[PDB]
Amino acid sequence: MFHEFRDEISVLKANNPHFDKIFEKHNQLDDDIKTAEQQNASDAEVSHMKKQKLKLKDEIHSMIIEYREKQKSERA
Numbered sequence: 001m002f003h004e005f006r007d008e009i010s011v012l013k014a015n016n017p018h019f020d021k022i023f024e025k026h027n028q029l030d031d032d033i034k035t036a037e038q039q040n041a042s043d044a045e046v047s048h049m050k051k052q053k054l055k056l057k058d059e060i061h062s063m064i065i066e067y068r069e070k071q072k073s074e075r076a
Contacts, residue, residue: 005064008064008067008068009061009064013060013061013064013067018063022060026056026057026059029049029052032049033046033049033052
């Protein structure tokens with residue numbers, strides 16, 4: 001919810017060269033969970049897809065962790 005969670009996560013993670021793979025794979029999950037949530041072909045299917053969301057999110061969120069430690073270690 002913090003500014004650095006949407007501004008640091010969307011600016012550094014949504015614009016970093018790694019976003020290509022980290023965001024494409026992550027954006028795919030959110031695309032598979034939403035496409036599955038549209039009709040909910042199967043609760044277990046829609047609930048299993050989300051499990052990959054927070055998982056594929058950890059990589060996007062984890063990037064910031066390494067970004068705040070590199071920017072503070074490299075810049076600070």
